[PDB]
Amino acid sequence: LNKNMKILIVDDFSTMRRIVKNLLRDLGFNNTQEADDGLTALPMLKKGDFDFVVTDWNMPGMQGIDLLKNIRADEELKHLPVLMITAEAKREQIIEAAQAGVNGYIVKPFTAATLKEKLDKIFE
Ligand SMILES: [Ca+2]
């Protein structure tokens, strides 16, 4: 893994975005930026050449699964690995996200330890 990979953290709750950014900081990943919704995340990915996306699944403008579908339907962005954040990994939710093309999921509240594990898993 490259500690300098460019990561976009997406969620409507500023406090949560900050917590994720800080946990990533603990793991040595400091090249992190933020978006408050799928609608503001897309243009950042479209013009920013990111390497990884950590998105919450529940957002009011454009939902997490739709951000994922938009990423996968765009020739320029479909390569992007995506980690979804969920309040509970219900089988139905995980199966749908998997069919939509998600790389992995993490259940909140989560720790830096678990985040590290999920990243390794995804980055392969
Ligand atoms: Ca949310």
Residue 11 Cα to ligand 1 midpoint, Å, equals: 5
Q: List the one residue out of 16, 17, 34, 24 whose CA is nearest residue 113.
A: 24
**CB-facing half-sphere around the CA of 108: CA atoms within 13 A:** 16
Burial class (CB in 10 A: 0-12, 13-18, 19+), 3: exposed
CB 96 within 8 A of CB 57: no
CATH architecture of 1-124: 3-Layer(aba) Sandwich (3.40)
Q: What is the resolution of this structure in A?
A: 1.6
Residue 41 Cα to ligand 1 midpoint, Å, equals: 13
Residue 61 Cα to ligand 1 midpoint, Å, equals: 11
Q: List the one residue out of 101, 63, 61 whose CA is nearest residue 83.
A: 101
Pick out the residues of the known binding site: 11-12, 56, 58
Residue 100 Cα to ligand 1 midpoint, Å, equals: 19
Residue 119 Cα to ligand 1 midpoint, Å, equals: 20
Task: Decide: helix, strand or coil at residue 78.
Answer: coil
Residue 92 Cα to ligand 1 midpoint, Å, equals: 18
Task: Decide: helix, strand or coil at residue 8.
Answer: strand
Record the tokens describing residue 84, joined without a space.
């979804």
Q: How many residues does the chain have?
A: 124
Record the tokens describing residue 18, joined without a space.
């900050």
Give CA–CA dist 85/119, Å, rounded. Answer: 13
Residue 48 Cα to ligand 1 midpoint, Å, equals: 23
Record the tokens describing residue 37, joined without a space.
């919704």
Return the beta strands (E) in the chain as ranges.
7-10, 32-35, 52-56, 82-86, 104-107
Pick out the residues of the known binding site for Mg(2+): 11-12, 56, 58
